[PDB]
Design a protein around this ligand. Sequence first.
Ligand SMILES: O=c1ccn(-c2cccc(OC(F)(F)F)c2)nc1-c1ccnn1-c1cccc2ccccc12
Ligand SMILES: [Mg+2]
Ligand SMILES: [Zn+2]
Length: 313
Amino acid sequence: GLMQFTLPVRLCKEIELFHFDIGPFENMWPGIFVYMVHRSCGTSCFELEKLCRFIMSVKKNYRRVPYHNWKHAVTVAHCMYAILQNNHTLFTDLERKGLLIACLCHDLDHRGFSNSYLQKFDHPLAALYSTSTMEQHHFSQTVSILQLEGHNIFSTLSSSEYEQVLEIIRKAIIATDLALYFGNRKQLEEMYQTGSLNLNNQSHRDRVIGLMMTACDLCSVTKLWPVTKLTANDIYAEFWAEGDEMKKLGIQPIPMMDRDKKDEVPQGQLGFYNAVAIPCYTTLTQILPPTEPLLKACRDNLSQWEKVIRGEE
Ligand SMILES: O=c1ccn(-c2cccc(OC(F)(F)F)c2)nc1-c1ccnn1-c1cccc2ccccc12
Ligand SMILES: [Mg+2]
Ligand SMILES: [Zn+2]
């Protein structure tokens, strides 16, 4: 109860910023996460012993893939922590508890393959869940680990609150299906411009939480250029592996995933910042003004990719 997790000075300060990188020391990421729960939610909200057992089982269930790994889980949870701390009074005690857990678990047991590949391979998970295939898996895994012994970190919640928080986590995880993002932002933009957006409408909160989730999940594009540049390697290493597996099924993959078309990447990153990332942080800044740093940093990197194309690096 009196055991305040503290970080070294540079981490204690840099962690409050949106562009924080959690660094190369795996063994520190669990301390970083707990520190974020304690600051974001209270020393009270979870039982330190049960939390630690839960974190470690979740770590154990992320795989050794180039990008969709434990480090991504904790990076996405850090961004969410940054948003919650910069919007201190907009969110309930339960949302804060559930949203940091949703992010840590959002990519549980990812193998580095898109829903498309699962469908074209005819993976058993594609029979079980037709849409948002991996995302229903990730939630289903979160529920599994919650149900292990000494792992129920929500035990002190009523039956009501327990169902509300698991329903926050489910929508949160589902919303990381980028196919769902496009229509979700369209609707939030229209509600905001015609002034009908209302954070008491549970239907509207749900949409806003989904957009935060897209924003946290994309947050590699909001880091300082050297971090963004080096993460793109990890992202594309998974893309090229999936393309290889597409070719193995007798299917020319889209160029994004074709490793023979490495040369087309910088223009592909342009597409994605213009079509996906910039729109995402624009609409999110309109709803939650204090998240502006993510937009600025995203623009900064869009600009860094244009420099790549113009042979200035
Ligand atoms: O640089 C990029 C170029 C293209 N896509 C992309 C486009 C279209 C569908 C798409 O998802 C799919 F691969 F499942 F098909 C990814 N994403 C990124 C990117 C930047 C930061 N994160 N990130 C992501 C990399 C890999 C899975 C991501 C999943 C969701 C959001 C961002 C994901
Ligand atoms: Mg995912
Ligand atoms: Zn993710």
